[PDB]
Amino acid sequence: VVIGIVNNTVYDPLQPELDSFKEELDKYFKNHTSP
Amino acid sequence: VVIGIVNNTVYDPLQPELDSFKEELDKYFKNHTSP
Amino acid sequence: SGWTFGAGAALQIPFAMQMAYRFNGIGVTQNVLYENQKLIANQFNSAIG
Ligand SMILES: *[C@@H]1O[C@H](CO)[C@@H](O[C@@H]2O[C@H](CO)[C@@H](O[C@H]3O[C@H](CO)[C@@H](O)[C@H](O)[C@@H]3O)[C@H](O)[C@H]2NC(C)=O)[C@H](O)[C@H]1NC(C)=O
Ligand SMILES: *[C@@H]1O[C@H](CO)[C@@H](O[C@@H]2O[C@H](CO)[C@@H](O[C@H]3O[C@H](CO)[C@@H](O)[C@H](O)[C@@H]3O)[C@H](O)[C@H]2NC(C)=O)[C@H](O)[C@H]1NC(C)=O
Ligand SMILES: *[C@@H]1O[C@H](CO)[C@@H](O)[C@H](O)[C@H]1NC(C)=O
Ligand SMILES: *[C@@H]1O[C@H](CO)[C@@H](O)[C@H](O)[C@H]1NC(C)=O
Incomplete structure:
Protein backbone atom coordinates (compact mmCIF):
# COMPACT_ATOMS: atom_id res chain seq x y z
CA VAL A 1 0.00 0.00 0.00
CA VAL A 2 2.82 2.49 0.90
CA ILE A 3 4.62 4.42 -1.88
CA GLY A 4 8.45 4.26 -1.50
CA ILE A 5 8.66 1.66 1.36
CA VAL A 6 12.11 -0.09 1.69
CA ASN A 7 13.19 -3.60 2.78
CA ASN A 8 15.22 -3.88 6.00
CA THR A 9 15.41 -6.11 9.12
CA VAL A 10 13.57 -5.11 12.31
CA TYR A 11 15.30 -6.48 15.42
CA ASP A 12 13.25 -7.92 18.31
CA PRO A 13 14.82 -7.56 21.82
CA LEU A 14 12.44 -10.26 23.13
CA VAL B 1 -12.76 3.29 41.97
CA VAL B 2 -13.65 4.26 38.33
CA ILE B 3 -17.26 5.25 37.45
CA GLY B 4 -18.52 3.40 34.32
CA ILE B 5 -15.58 0.93 33.85
CA VAL B 6 -16.42 -2.17 31.67
CA ASN B 7 -15.24 -5.82 31.69
CA ASN B 8 -13.21 -7.02 28.69
CA THR B 9 -10.11 -9.14 27.97
CA VAL B 10 -6.70 -7.49 27.52
CA TYR B 11 -4.43 -9.54 25.24
CA ASP B 12 -0.71 -9.97 26.07
CA PRO B 13 1.64 -10.40 23.04
CA LEU B 14 4.34 -11.78 25.38
CA SER C 1 11.83 21.85 3.81
CA GLY C 2 8.67 22.37 5.97
CA TRP C 3 9.07 24.32 9.25
CA THR C 4 12.90 23.85 9.31
CA PHE C 5 13.78 27.01 7.28
CA GLY C 6 11.96 29.07 9.97
CA ALA C 7 14.08 27.75 12.88
CA GLY C 8 17.55 27.50 11.17
CA ALA C 9 19.06 26.69 7.75
CA ALA C 10 16.54 24.98 5.39
CA LEU C 11 16.78 21.16 5.75
CA GLN C 12 15.33 19.11 2.85
CA ILE C 13 12.64 16.48 3.52
CA PRO C 14 10.41 14.50 1.06
CA PHE C 15 7.01 16.24 0.88
CA ALA C 16 5.02 13.12 1.87
CA MET C 17 7.25 12.81 4.99
CA GLN C 18 6.62 16.49 5.76
CA MET C 19 2.86 15.74 5.53
CA ALA C 20 3.37 12.76 7.90
CA TYR C 21 5.00 15.06 10.46
CA ARG C 22 1.99 17.35 10.07
CA PHE C 23 -0.50 14.52 10.60
CA ASN C 24 1.30 13.61 13.88
CA GLY C 25 0.98 17.35 14.76
CA ILE C 26 -2.87 17.15 14.54
CA GLY C 27 -2.85 13.87 16.57
CA VAL C 28 -3.45 11.49 13.59
CA THR C 29 -0.83 8.73 13.36
CA GLN C 30 1.44 9.05 10.29
CA ASN C 31 0.38 5.69 8.77
CA VAL C 32 -3.02 7.37 8.01
CA LEU C 33 -1.17 9.58 5.49
CA TYR C 34 0.82 6.85 3.72
CA GLU C 35 -2.17 4.43 3.56
CA ASN C 36 -4.23 7.26 1.86
CA GLN C 37 -1.58 9.44 0.10
CA LYS C 38 -3.17 9.39 -3.41
CA LEU C 39 -6.56 10.40 -1.90
CA ILE C 40 -5.03 13.12 0.34
CA ALA C 41 -3.21 14.50 -2.73
CA ASN C 42 -6.37 14.31 -4.94
CA GLN C 43 -8.34 16.15 -2.22
CA PHE C 44 -5.64 18.86 -1.96
CA ASN C 45 -5.40 19.19 -5.79
CA SER C 46 -9.23 19.48 -6.03
CA ALA C 47 -9.31 22.04 -3.18
CA ILE C 48 -6.63 24.22 -4.91
CA GLY C 49 -8.70 23.94 -8.14
C1 LIG D 1 11.31 -6.06 -1.04
O1 LIG D 1 11.27 -7.40 -0.47
C2 LIG D 1 10.23 -8.27 -1.03
C3 LIG D 1 10.20 -9.60 -0.26
O2 LIG D 1 11.44 -10.31 -0.43
C4 LIG D 1 10.50 -8.42 -2.53
O3 LIG D 1 9.39 -9.21 -3.09
C5 LIG D 1 9.80 -10.24 -4.04
O4 LIG D 1 9.92 -9.66 -5.37
C6 LIG D 1 10.26 -10.59 -6.47
C7 LIG D 1 10.17 -9.81 -7.79
O5 LIG D 1 8.90 -9.13 -7.88
C8 LIG D 1 9.34 -11.83 -6.46
O6 LIG D 1 9.97 -12.84 -7.34
C9 LIG D 1 9.01 -13.63 -8.11
O7 LIG D 1 8.48 -12.83 -9.23
C10 LIG D 1 7.45 -13.53 -10.07
C11 LIG D 1 6.06 -13.40 -9.43
O8 LIG D 1 5.72 -12.00 -9.26
C12 LIG D 1 7.85 -15.00 -10.33
O9 LIG D 1 7.52 -15.33 -11.70
C13 LIG D 1 9.36 -15.18 -10.12
O10 LIG D 1 9.81 -16.50 -10.52
C14 LIG D 1 9.72 -14.91 -8.64
O11 LIG D 1 9.30 -16.03 -7.81
C15 LIG D 1 9.19 -12.43 -5.05
O12 LIG D 1 8.23 -13.52 -5.07
C16 LIG D 1 8.74 -11.35 -4.07
N1 LIG D 1 8.53 -11.92 -2.73
C17 LIG D 1 7.35 -11.88 -2.11
C18 LIG D 1 7.31 -12.47 -0.70
O13 LIG D 1 6.35 -11.41 -2.65
C19 LIG D 1 10.53 -7.05 -3.21
O14 LIG D 1 10.81 -7.21 -4.62
C20 LIG D 1 11.59 -6.14 -2.56
N2 LIG D 1 11.57 -4.82 -3.19
C21 LIG D 1 12.60 -3.98 -3.18
C22 LIG D 1 12.45 -2.72 -4.03
O15 LIG D 1 13.61 -4.21 -2.50
C1 LIG E 1 -17.33 -7.12 35.95
O1 LIG E 1 -16.55 -8.32 36.25
C2 LIG E 1 -16.43 -8.63 37.68
C3 LIG E 1 -15.48 -9.82 37.87
O2 LIG E 1 -16.01 -11.00 37.25
C4 LIG E 1 -17.84 -8.86 38.23
O3 LIG E 1 -17.71 -9.06 39.68
C5 LIG E 1 -18.51 -10.16 40.21
O4 LIG E 1 -19.85 -9.67 40.51
C6 LIG E 1 -20.79 -10.63 41.13
C7 LIG E 1 -22.07 -9.87 41.51
O5 LIG E 1 -21.74 -8.70 42.29
C8 LIG E 1 -20.15 -11.34 42.34
O6 LIG E 1 -20.99 -12.51 42.66
C9 LIG E 1 -21.12 -12.78 44.09
O7 LIG E 1 -22.02 -11.81 44.72
C10 LIG E 1 -22.19 -11.97 46.20
C11 LIG E 1 -21.06 -11.24 46.95
O8 LIG E 1 -21.04 -9.85 46.58
C12 LIG E 1 -22.31 -13.46 46.59
O9 LIG E 1 -23.31 -13.59 47.63
C13 LIG E 1 -22.73 -14.29 45.37
O10 LIG E 1 -23.02 -15.67 45.74
C14 LIG E 1 -21.63 -14.23 44.29
O11 LIG E 1 -20.50 -15.07 44.68
C15 LIG E 1 -18.72 -11.83 42.03
O12 LIG E 1 -18.11 -12.39 43.23
C16 LIG E 1 -17.87 -10.68 41.50
N1 LIG E 1 -16.49 -11.13 41.27
C17 LIG E 1 -15.45 -10.58 41.89
C18 LIG E 1 -14.07 -11.11 41.49
O13 LIG E 1 -15.58 -9.70 42.74
C19 LIG E 1 -18.72 -7.63 37.98
O14 LIG E 1 -20.06 -7.88 38.48
C20 LIG E 1 -18.77 -7.29 36.48
N2 LIG E 1 -19.58 -6.09 36.26
C21 LIG E 1 -20.18 -5.80 35.11
C22 LIG E 1 -21.11 -4.58 35.12
O15 LIG E 1 -19.97 -6.46 34.09
C1 LIG F 1 24.74 -31.79 34.93
O1 LIG F 1 23.80 -32.26 35.95
C2 LIG F 1 24.33 -32.25 37.34
C3 LIG F 1 23.25 -32.78 38.29
O2 LIG F 1 23.01 -34.18 38.03
C4 LIG F 1 24.77 -30.82 37.68
O3 LIG F 1 25.35 -30.80 39.00
C5 LIG F 1 25.83 -30.33 36.70
O4 LIG F 1 26.18 -28.96 37.04
C6 LIG F 1 25.29 -30.38 35.27
N1 LIG F 1 26.34 -29.97 34.32
C7 LIG F 1 26.07 -29.29 33.21
C8 LIG F 1 27.26 -29.03 32.28
O5 LIG F 1 24.94 -28.91 32.93
C1 LIG G 1 13.69 -36.73 18.70
O1 LIG G 1 15.09 -36.74 19.15
C2 LIG G 1 16.09 -37.00 18.07
C3 LIG G 1 17.49 -37.01 18.68
O2 LIG G 1 17.64 -38.15 19.55
C4 LIG G 1 15.93 -35.91 17.00
O3 LIG G 1 16.84 -36.17 15.91
C5 LIG G 1 14.51 -35.92 16.42
O4 LIG G 1 14.39 -34.86 15.44
C6 LIG G 1 13.48 -35.71 17.54
N1 LIG G 1 12.12 -35.79 17.00
C7 LIG G 1 11.12 -35.05 17.46
C8 LIG G 1 9.73 -35.32 16.85
O5 LIG G 1 11.29 -34.20 18.34
Missing part, protein backbone atom coordinates in the same frame (compact mmCIF):
# COMPACT_ATOMS: atom_id res chain seq x y z
CA GLN A 15 13.99 -12.80 20.69
CA PRO A 16 17.61 -13.39 21.96
CA GLU A 17 16.08 -13.05 25.49
CA LEU A 18 13.97 -16.06 24.43
CA ASP A 19 16.76 -17.77 22.44
CA SER A 20 19.51 -17.70 25.13
CA PHE A 21 16.71 -19.24 27.25
CA LYS A 22 16.42 -21.96 24.52
CA GLU A 23 20.21 -22.54 24.97
CA GLU A 24 19.64 -22.80 28.78
CA LEU A 25 16.64 -25.19 28.20
CA ASP A 26 18.63 -27.26 25.67
CA LYS A 27 21.69 -27.70 27.98
CA TYR A 28 19.27 -29.11 30.63
CA PHE A 29 18.24 -31.83 28.07
CA LYS A 30 21.82 -32.46 26.72
CA ASN A 31 23.15 -33.02 30.30
CA HIS A 32 19.99 -34.92 31.47
CA THR A 33 20.86 -37.57 28.81
CA SER A 34 23.46 -38.78 31.39
CA PRO A 35 21.88 -39.43 34.91
CA GLN B 15 2.02 -14.71 26.32
CA PRO B 16 1.71 -16.86 23.09
CA GLU B 17 5.41 -15.93 22.51
CA LEU B 18 5.97 -17.69 25.87
CA ASP B 19 3.35 -20.42 25.28
CA SER B 20 4.53 -21.62 21.82
CA PHE B 21 7.90 -21.79 23.65
CA LYS B 22 6.14 -24.06 26.24
CA GLU B 23 5.03 -26.27 23.27
CA GLU B 24 8.70 -26.30 22.03
CA LEU B 25 9.93 -27.11 25.62
CA ASP B 26 7.25 -29.81 26.06
CA LYS B 27 8.07 -31.60 22.74
CA TYR B 28 11.71 -31.83 23.96
CA PHE B 29 10.42 -33.77 27.06
CA LYS B 30 7.83 -35.90 25.12
CA ASN B 31 10.52 -37.05 22.62
CA HIS B 32 13.29 -37.38 25.31
CA THR B 33 11.08 -40.09 26.93
CA SER B 34 12.48 -42.37 24.15
CA PRO B 35 16.39 -42.31 24.00
Whole structure:
Protein backbone atom coordinates (compact mmCIF):
# COMPACT_ATOMS: atom_id res chain seq x y z
CA VAL A 1 0.00 0.00 0.00
CA VAL A 2 2.82 2.49 0.90
CA ILE A 3 4.62 4.42 -1.88
CA GLY A 4 8.45 4.26 -1.50
CA ILE A 5 8.66 1.66 1.36
CA VAL A 6 12.11 -0.09 1.69
CA ASN A 7 13.19 -3.60 2.78
CA ASN A 8 15.22 -3.88 6.00
CA THR A 9 15.41 -6.11 9.12
CA VAL A 10 13.57 -5.11 12.31
CA TYR A 11 15.30 -6.48 15.42
CA ASP A 12 13.25 -7.92 18.31
CA PRO A 13 14.82 -7.56 21.82
CA LEU A 14 12.44 -10.26 23.13
CA GLN A 15 13.99 -12.80 20.69
CA PRO A 16 17.61 -13.39 21.96
CA GLU A 17 16.08 -13.05 25.49
CA LEU A 18 13.97 -16.06 24.43
CA ASP A 19 16.76 -17.77 22.44
CA SER A 20 19.51 -17.70 25.13
CA PHE A 21 16.71 -19.24 27.25
CA LYS A 22 16.42 -21.96 24.52
CA GLU A 23 20.21 -22.54 24.97
CA GLU A 24 19.64 -22.80 28.78
CA LEU A 25 16.64 -25.19 28.20
CA ASP A 26 18.63 -27.26 25.67
CA LYS A 27 21.69 -27.70 27.98
CA TYR A 28 19.27 -29.11 30.63
CA PHE A 29 18.24 -31.83 28.07
CA LYS A 30 21.82 -32.46 26.72
CA ASN A 31 23.15 -33.02 30.30
CA HIS A 32 19.99 -34.92 31.47
CA THR A 33 20.86 -37.57 28.81
CA SER A 34 23.46 -38.78 31.39
CA PRO A 35 21.88 -39.43 34.91
CA VAL B 1 -12.76 3.29 41.97
CA VAL B 2 -13.65 4.26 38.33
CA ILE B 3 -17.26 5.25 37.45
CA GLY B 4 -18.52 3.40 34.32
CA ILE B 5 -15.58 0.93 33.85
CA VAL B 6 -16.42 -2.17 31.67
CA ASN B 7 -15.24 -5.82 31.69
CA ASN B 8 -13.21 -7.02 28.69
CA THR B 9 -10.11 -9.14 27.97
CA VAL B 10 -6.70 -7.49 27.52
CA TYR B 11 -4.43 -9.54 25.24
CA ASP B 12 -0.71 -9.97 26.07
CA PRO B 13 1.64 -10.40 23.04
CA LEU B 14 4.34 -11.78 25.38
CA GLN B 15 2.02 -14.71 26.32
CA PRO B 16 1.71 -16.86 23.09
CA GLU B 17 5.41 -15.93 22.51
CA LEU B 18 5.97 -17.69 25.87
CA ASP B 19 3.35 -20.42 25.28
CA SER B 20 4.53 -21.62 21.82
CA PHE B 21 7.90 -21.79 23.65
CA LYS B 22 6.14 -24.06 26.24
CA GLU B 23 5.03 -26.27 23.27
CA GLU B 24 8.70 -26.30 22.03
CA LEU B 25 9.93 -27.11 25.62
CA ASP B 26 7.25 -29.81 26.06
CA LYS B 27 8.07 -31.60 22.74
CA TYR B 28 11.71 -31.83 23.96
CA PHE B 29 10.42 -33.77 27.06
CA LYS B 30 7.83 -35.90 25.12
CA ASN B 31 10.52 -37.05 22.62
CA HIS B 32 13.29 -37.38 25.31
CA THR B 33 11.08 -40.09 26.93
CA SER B 34 12.48 -42.37 24.15
CA PRO B 35 16.39 -42.31 24.00
CA SER C 1 11.83 21.85 3.81
CA GLY C 2 8.67 22.37 5.97
CA TRP C 3 9.07 24.32 9.25
CA THR C 4 12.90 23.85 9.31
CA PHE C 5 13.78 27.01 7.28
CA GLY C 6 11.96 29.07 9.97
CA ALA C 7 14.08 27.75 12.88
CA GLY C 8 17.55 27.50 11.17
CA ALA C 9 19.06 26.69 7.75
CA ALA C 10 16.54 24.98 5.39
CA LEU C 11 16.78 21.16 5.75
CA GLN C 12 15.33 19.11 2.85
CA ILE C 13 12.64 16.48 3.52
CA PRO C 14 10.41 14.50 1.06
CA PHE C 15 7.01 16.24 0.88
CA ALA C 16 5.02 13.12 1.87
CA MET C 17 7.25 12.81 4.99
CA GLN C 18 6.62 16.49 5.76
CA MET C 19 2.86 15.74 5.53
CA ALA C 20 3.37 12.76 7.90
CA TYR C 21 5.00 15.06 10.46
CA ARG C 22 1.99 17.35 10.07
CA PHE C 23 -0.50 14.52 10.60
CA ASN C 24 1.30 13.61 13.88
CA GLY C 25 0.98 17.35 14.76
CA ILE C 26 -2.87 17.15 14.54
CA GLY C 27 -2.85 13.87 16.57
CA VAL C 28 -3.45 11.49 13.59
CA THR C 29 -0.83 8.73 13.36
CA GLN C 30 1.44 9.05 10.29
CA ASN C 31 0.38 5.69 8.77
CA VAL C 32 -3.02 7.37 8.01
CA LEU C 33 -1.17 9.58 5.49
CA TYR C 34 0.82 6.85 3.72
CA GLU C 35 -2.17 4.43 3.56
CA ASN C 36 -4.23 7.26 1.86
CA GLN C 37 -1.58 9.44 0.10
CA LYS C 38 -3.17 9.39 -3.41
CA LEU C 39 -6.56 10.40 -1.90
CA ILE C 40 -5.03 13.12 0.34
CA ALA C 41 -3.21 14.50 -2.73
CA ASN C 42 -6.37 14.31 -4.94
CA GLN C 43 -8.34 16.15 -2.22
CA PHE C 44 -5.64 18.86 -1.96
CA ASN C 45 -5.40 19.19 -5.79
CA SER C 46 -9.23 19.48 -6.03
CA ALA C 47 -9.31 22.04 -3.18
CA ILE C 48 -6.63 24.22 -4.91
CA GLY C 49 -8.70 23.94 -8.14
C1 LIG D 1 11.31 -6.06 -1.04
O1 LIG D 1 11.27 -7.40 -0.47
C2 LIG D 1 10.23 -8.27 -1.03
C3 LIG D 1 10.20 -9.60 -0.26
O2 LIG D 1 11.44 -10.31 -0.43
C4 LIG D 1 10.50 -8.42 -2.53
O3 LIG D 1 9.39 -9.21 -3.09
C5 LIG D 1 9.80 -10.24 -4.04
O4 LIG D 1 9.92 -9.66 -5.37
C6 LIG D 1 10.26 -10.59 -6.47
C7 LIG D 1 10.17 -9.81 -7.79
O5 LIG D 1 8.90 -9.13 -7.88
C8 LIG D 1 9.34 -11.83 -6.46
O6 LIG D 1 9.97 -12.84 -7.34
C9 LIG D 1 9.01 -13.63 -8.11
O7 LIG D 1 8.48 -12.83 -9.23
C10 LIG D 1 7.45 -13.53 -10.07
C11 LIG D 1 6.06 -13.40 -9.43
O8 LIG D 1 5.72 -12.00 -9.26
C12 LIG D 1 7.85 -15.00 -10.33
O9 LIG D 1 7.52 -15.33 -11.70
C13 LIG D 1 9.36 -15.18 -10.12
O10 LIG D 1 9.81 -16.50 -10.52
C14 LIG D 1 9.72 -14.91 -8.64
O11 LIG D 1 9.30 -16.03 -7.81
C15 LIG D 1 9.19 -12.43 -5.05
O12 LIG D 1 8.23 -13.52 -5.07
C16 LIG D 1 8.74 -11.35 -4.07
N1 LIG D 1 8.53 -11.92 -2.73
C17 LIG D 1 7.35 -11.88 -2.11
C18 LIG D 1 7.31 -12.47 -0.70
O13 LIG D 1 6.35 -11.41 -2.65
C19 LIG D 1 10.53 -7.05 -3.21
O14 LIG D 1 10.81 -7.21 -4.62
C20 LIG D 1 11.59 -6.14 -2.56
N2 LIG D 1 11.57 -4.82 -3.19
C21 LIG D 1 12.60 -3.98 -3.18
C22 LIG D 1 12.45 -2.72 -4.03
O15 LIG D 1 13.61 -4.21 -2.50
C1 LIG E 1 -17.33 -7.12 35.95
O1 LIG E 1 -16.55 -8.32 36.25
C2 LIG E 1 -16.43 -8.63 37.68
C3 LIG E 1 -15.48 -9.82 37.87
O2 LIG E 1 -16.01 -11.00 37.25
C4 LIG E 1 -17.84 -8.86 38.23
O3 LIG E 1 -17.71 -9.06 39.68
C5 LIG E 1 -18.51 -10.16 40.21
O4 LIG E 1 -19.85 -9.67 40.51
C6 LIG E 1 -20.79 -10.63 41.13
C7 LIG E 1 -22.07 -9.87 41.51
O5 LIG E 1 -21.74 -8.70 42.29
C8 LIG E 1 -20.15 -11.34 42.34
O6 LIG E 1 -20.99 -12.51 42.66
C9 LIG E 1 -21.12 -12.78 44.09
O7 LIG E 1 -22.02 -11.81 44.72
C10 LIG E 1 -22.19 -11.97 46.20
C11 LIG E 1 -21.06 -11.24 46.95
O8 LIG E 1 -21.04 -9.85 46.58
C12 LIG E 1 -22.31 -13.46 46.59
O9 LIG E 1 -23.31 -13.59 47.63
C13 LIG E 1 -22.73 -14.29 45.37
O10 LIG E 1 -23.02 -15.67 45.74
C14 LIG E 1 -21.63 -14.23 44.29
O11 LIG E 1 -20.50 -15.07 44.68
C15 LIG E 1 -18.72 -11.83 42.03
O12 LIG E 1 -18.11 -12.39 43.23
C16 LIG E 1 -17.87 -10.68 41.50
N1 LIG E 1 -16.49 -11.13 41.27
C17 LIG E 1 -15.45 -10.58 41.89
C18 LIG E 1 -14.07 -11.11 41.49
O13 LIG E 1 -15.58 -9.70 42.74
C19 LIG E 1 -18.72 -7.63 37.98
O14 LIG E 1 -20.06 -7.88 38.48
C20 LIG E 1 -18.77 -7.29 36.48
N2 LIG E 1 -19.58 -6.09 36.26
C21 LIG E 1 -20.18 -5.80 35.11
C22 LIG E 1 -21.11 -4.58 35.12
O15 LIG E 1 -19.97 -6.46 34.09
C1 LIG F 1 24.74 -31.79 34.93
O1 LIG F 1 23.80 -32.26 35.95
C2 LIG F 1 24.33 -32.25 37.34
C3 LIG F 1 23.25 -32.78 38.29
O2 LIG F 1 23.01 -34.18 38.03
C4 LIG F 1 24.77 -30.82 37.68
O3 LIG F 1 25.35 -30.80 39.00
C5 LIG F 1 25.83 -30.33 36.70
O4 LIG F 1 26.18 -28.96 37.04
C6 LIG F 1 25.29 -30.38 35.27
N1 LIG F 1 26.34 -29.97 34.32
C7 LIG F 1 26.07 -29.29 33.21
C8 LIG F 1 27.26 -29.03 32.28
O5 LIG F 1 24.94 -28.91 32.93
C1 LIG G 1 13.69 -36.73 18.70
O1 LIG G 1 15.09 -36.74 19.15
C2 LIG G 1 16.09 -37.00 18.07
C3 LIG G 1 17.49 -37.01 18.68
O2 LIG G 1 17.64 -38.15 19.55
C4 LIG G 1 15.93 -35.91 17.00
O3 LIG G 1 16.84 -36.17 15.91
C5 LIG G 1 14.51 -35.92 16.42
O4 LIG G 1 14.39 -34.86 15.44
C6 LIG G 1 13.48 -35.71 17.54
N1 LIG G 1 12.12 -35.79 17.00
C7 LIG G 1 11.12 -35.05 17.46
C8 LIG G 1 9.73 -35.32 16.85
O5 LIG G 1 11.29 -34.20 18.34
